[PDB]
Amino acid sequence: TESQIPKMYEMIRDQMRTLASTHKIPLNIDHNCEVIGSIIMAACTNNRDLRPVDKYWFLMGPAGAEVMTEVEIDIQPQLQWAKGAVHDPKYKGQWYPFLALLQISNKTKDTILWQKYPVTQELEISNSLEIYANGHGIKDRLKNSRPRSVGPLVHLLHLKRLQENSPAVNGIRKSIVGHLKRQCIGETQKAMINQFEMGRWESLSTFAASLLAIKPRIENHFVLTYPLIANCEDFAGATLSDEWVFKAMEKISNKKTLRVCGPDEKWISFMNQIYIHSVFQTTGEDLGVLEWVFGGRFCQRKEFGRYCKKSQTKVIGLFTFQYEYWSKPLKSAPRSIEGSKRGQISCRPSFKGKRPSYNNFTSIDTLQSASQTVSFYDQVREECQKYMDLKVEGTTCFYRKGGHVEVEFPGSAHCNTYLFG
Amino acid sequence: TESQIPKMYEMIRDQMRTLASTHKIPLNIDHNCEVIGSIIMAACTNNRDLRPVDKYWFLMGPAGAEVMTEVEIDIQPQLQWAKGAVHDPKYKGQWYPFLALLQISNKTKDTILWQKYPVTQELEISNSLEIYANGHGIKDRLKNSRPRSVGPLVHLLHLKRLQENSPAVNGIRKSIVGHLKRQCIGETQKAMINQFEMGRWESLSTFAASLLAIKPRIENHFVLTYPLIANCEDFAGATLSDEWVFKAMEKISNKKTLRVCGPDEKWISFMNQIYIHSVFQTTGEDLGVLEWVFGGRFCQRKEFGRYCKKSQTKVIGLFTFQYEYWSKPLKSAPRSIEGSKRGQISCRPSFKGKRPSYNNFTSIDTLQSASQTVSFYDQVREECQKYMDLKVEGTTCFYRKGGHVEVEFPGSAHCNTYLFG
Amino acid sequence: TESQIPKMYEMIRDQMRTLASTHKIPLNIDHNCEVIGSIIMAACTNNRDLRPVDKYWFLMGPAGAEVMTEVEIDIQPQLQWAKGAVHDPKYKGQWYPFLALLQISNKTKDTILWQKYPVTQELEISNSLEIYANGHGIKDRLKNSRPRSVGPLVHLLHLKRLQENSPAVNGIRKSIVGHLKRQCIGETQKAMINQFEMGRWESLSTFAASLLAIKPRIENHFVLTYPLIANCEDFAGATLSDEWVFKAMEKISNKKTLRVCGPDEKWISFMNQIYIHSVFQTTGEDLGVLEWVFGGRFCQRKEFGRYCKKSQTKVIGLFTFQYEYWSKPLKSAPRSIEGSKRGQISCRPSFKGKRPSYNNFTSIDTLQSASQTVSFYDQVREECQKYMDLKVEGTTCFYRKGGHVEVEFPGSAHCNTYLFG
């Protein structure tokens, strides 16, 4: 499944530099790579909506005198290659599943800079839940190539849209539900999806809230963004899922040739952190964990105002990256109550001596563990409290840099803080 | 609105010393000032209930040999002046609005020493809510001069009393409701007041509990108490709302002439702290903030037993005051959800690495953010959770002493502790 | 009530060594004492189920060459003595009440090593509540001698069993209910027992959950286990309820002659801690308090796997014990809301200065303190929140070792952790 990753990375980077050098467009500027990279993406996917010759905005000029200017560029070489490469048997069909991950990676930056909440706004649920709407805005043909990488509310938004629009309805609805029930591990959650499948949406707010307790299964992959791809000189053992990516970004960072763009120099750490969020998909991650992993503090998006408009970005510094530990991408749900037992959570004193009094429950509702028939909302709450009661998240381990020696994450005072908090 | 504050302070202090010196009553003892001050107050307000000659309890004697004794005193000079000064056009009507603030200030000490809960007891709600019953016991004609300074449960107690007693009912009820809806900023809170206005009191417990989340708008003013007023030699630029009051109390404290009374010397810090609670109305304030502001620890009322009876107080030390930061009096509600967005409050891991698991919600009820019609109690809870979710309280800033350089309050380990906790 | 404790301890130890020395069974090995001690117990209680000659498993051998082997032993001397001693008027009837406490003490080790949840499993309630099922498995005739030492769910399991099986039903049910209502101090709790008494068990989950807030009254006694009894040379002033027990265990520990058994040497601290849990009945205690009391960290049961089988235990170290503070055994419920007043729990700012915002309530439900009729579940919750609101637990004090100087427990970072947590 990753045998072709090396050669597909190579093919992307090549088409990028071919098209950039033909029009004298320097690829040591990350903004140029972002625009060139998205044009190549569009030739592989929506072959018919882009124009054979069109004008785009690049940083043109010599040796740090670059200015943004509209360059007319011709894609019919890249277009002809792209329409073949979709079905080329040499890639063993691994092309579209790879393009979808590449689009998730390369669209991450804009979802950070231009924080909106299209999916929870359309579903009419709390915008705290947009963290589970990832992969929104990917071309649909790519979405069918990576349904496990698409957040559960994207699938849920697809289901409700279906009910507000043919005999193919029985087959489309079946597969959307199928993607939903693989992601949503809760017994009460699958029951709620069943209700949604029959158009009964009363459970929506409760289902949506349950996703922060009984967390869904979201597949992650570590995919380089277009500026990294163009400036990577060796894809020899490329993976999307182990220390290679970490080592690849350190190698480019050490080259100190790729420059990054932004509104002004106060953004230079943030831009660089945005590379980590795109490649490793840590946009939703705990910032305390991230600081430990990469060895530096991460900004929250609050710490800056609105991004400037893409035409008014400027070079503001150099790409930089380093890391202290690494980890593989999570594929299973982060929390499991399998073989979990809430044990003693209260004191039964035997000494008369006074001492502080604890209650490890918010109310006696949180301890109602049910035999006598129970109501559905209580079923939900009880199942959620079981996952809430877990004190650890994740599945295996972090590794020290330069090997696979397992190092337990020690903790942080910056834990339980978040990029959009 | 404060142009007359200097001259009204002057007039109070003058009438006080005039009446004290006529009967050889020393004003360097705070208890004497408290009794003399309340007699002058009563001449300006309930002109007909006090007696022209009557006996009161003062600390009489020479040079630290004072003993408490009943002195008969004659008020008909102070009484004649008082009946004029109510309507004297030279004060521009600012007299009663000032007398009401002075009575709030000078009644604060007794509400601390003799902690009872008349308003929540009469409303039959938790006595934790007496913090919102301030200004109770003020003469009603003064209450109409400062309805924004009167706690919302005083207005609420007035409304329920009205329904348990004429065509003026439509006008009295209207104005009480009007004061209530200006103080209670919650949309669900105004709906609950509407229900109360129509005699439906089922929401009482919920309305009362909501006041600790969606906090009401309470107007504060910094007004000197009678012992400070008599011992202040300069009212030149007097305000009730900026650093002048702070500087005025430091000036008297530095004189080291005013002595304070109490049951025994173990009360001497507490008595002095009671001056801060009366003048700056910090009775409800966070003791950790207070310690930072004034630079010393504040006692909780638990740390002492019952006050002795007023006849058995003795001189126990000197008035003392100092401060490190200052702030203006709050007039708006302390919490606002305007332009507030609860953002990301949960982690979506992308690394397999295990890490601690957080849940920033007590139950999945606390995340039910609602389109589908919602029940009223949930409306309340959801609105309350929005205010509960705020992490900061207050509106502007503290200033360092001796200027208006804004200094962010850094925090304290003594925060979230309270005078009646 | 304790006048006979010295002589009853003496009689137990004597019968133990008599039967052990007759068959050359060394009593300096704790496993031998445990088996011999339980045989003597069985002769005093279920006189007819044990066999006059039978084979048991002991550590036989010389001077650290002991191996486990089946020894046939003859009890008809110990049996003849035992059938008399039950009713011997010289013990003043104090025999059975003492045997029941001795059985609670000596069965504690197995309930730790072989953690099961028979009572909550049979009641079908959360196994977090097995902490309130103590004294289960005691011979019933002993249970009637110490009903206050039997956890409330044992009595509750007895009541439900009664309803699933005669004119004596009115008298048995009455006394079980009577034991239940003395243990369960909550007004809503007694109401729930009343419902159970009439076979209405809907309240079960709520009653069971309420026991962690409104904690029941459980009687404790400090009783030596069989290995301590055999190796105690002086019962002169023996009590079950003051510093004597502490001093008695230190004396044997200092002898360094009793060896303890377990699966391997990594258990040697845990085994020794199990002596403290049996004698002082701290199985349910706060481990942070325990560490302070005895001056060493206590293991949680998680820190080890399953015990080996009793035939495969080996000597792994020496008995050891020490202590820094002591306390009497608790007899009353650990929490009381009598004369408790929740006071100010919220801030009413008077300064405009911003500051952190606290809410000392999980939801506005937790503040609903009710006049207007309230529903029963809310009655429960409100009563429970009153006990939840208490910040201190226990009734009197701890004492420093070697006297009765009261020392307030200072706290611990290891508090709110538990043996079965």
UniProtKB/Swiss-Prot annotation, chains A, B, C:
Cysteines paired by S-S bonds: none
The keyword Repeat is annotated on this UniProt entry: no
Molecular function GO labels: RNA binding
Subcellular location: Virion
GO CC terms of this entry: helical viral capsid; host cell; host cell nucleus; ribonucleoprotein complex; viral nucleocapsid
Any one Gene Ontology BP term: symbiont entry into host cell
Keywords for this protein: Capsid protein, Helical capsid protein, Ribonucleoprotein, RNA-binding, Viral nucleoprotein, Viral penetration into host nucleus, Virion, Virus entry into host cell
Domain of life: Viruses
Family per similarity comment: Belongs to the influenza viruses nucleoprotein family.
Function: Encapsidates the negative strand viral RNA, protecting it from nucleases. The encapsidated genomic RNA is termed the ribonucleoprotein (RNP) and serves as template for transcription and replication.
UniProt name for this protein: Nucleoprotein
Protein's organism: Thogoto virus (isolate SiAr 126)
Lineage, top ranks: Viruses, Riboviria, Orthornavirae, Negarnaviricota, Polyploviricotina
